[PDB]
Scaffold this active site. Structure first.
Site: not given
Ligand SMILES: [Zn+2]
Ligand SMILES: [Zn+2]
Length: 180
Positions: A133, A143, A148, A170
């Site tokens: 979050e 993702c 991830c 990310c």
């Molecule tokens: Zn990711």
């Molecule tokens: Zn989410």
């Protein structure tokens, strides 16, 4: 003489007093996200659950209402992340583990469905979903990499499979969005 703005101010807000291992959650989350955000200054707060957002039939709160509650909290924080042991949902979902402003200042995670007898498993789950979050609050979307932390999990199986870490992509996105 810390460079101004080098310390992200995170507020971890407990919406109730029935969150298992709250202190460990906050400690671990703080340590964990520092890899991505730098050394973070965490502050622990309480908030009241918004009863208007409680669905009596569902026995759940609308997560967004908790975000609104967090949004209404005094203090200057870069992020305010709520934790609750109450189960949450969003309109059209059976439940959510959490929800975040994407991007925005507030996020909330519920431990209700993350509970496990194994404390390490439990803590990892809560750290994962808080991190997930938190990623959203930095504008990260979901993702495709199932390892991830930003992978979208709608079950424990999925939470447990993914890492608590941001994948290469990310991490770059997050640092890119942090540059701001
Ligand atoms: Zn990711
Ligand atoms: Zn989410």
């Amino acid at each position: 003489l810390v460079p101004r703005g080098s310390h992200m101010k995170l507020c971890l807000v407990a919406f109730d007093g029935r969150i298992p291992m709250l202190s460990s959650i906050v400690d671990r989350f703080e340590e964990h996200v520092s890899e991505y955000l730098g050394e973070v200054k965490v502050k622990k707060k309480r908030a009241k659950l918004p009863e208007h957002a409680y669905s009596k039939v569902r026995g759940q709160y609308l997560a967004r209402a908790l975000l609104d509650t967090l949004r209404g909290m005094k203090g200057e924080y870069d992020r305010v992340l709520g934790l609750t042991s109450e189960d949450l949902y969003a309109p059209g979902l059976n439940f959510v583990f959490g929800q975040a402003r994407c991007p925005g200042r507030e996020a909330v995670v519920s431990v209700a469905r993350l509970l496990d007898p194994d404390p390490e498993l439990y803590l990892e789950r809560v750290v994962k979903e808080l991190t997930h979050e938190l990623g959203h609050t930095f504008g990260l979307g979901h993702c495709p990499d199932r390892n991830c932390v930003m992978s979208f999990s709608s079950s424990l199986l999925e939470v447990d499979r993914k890492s608590p870490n941001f994948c290469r992509r990310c991490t770059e996105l997050l640092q890119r969005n942090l540059k701001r």
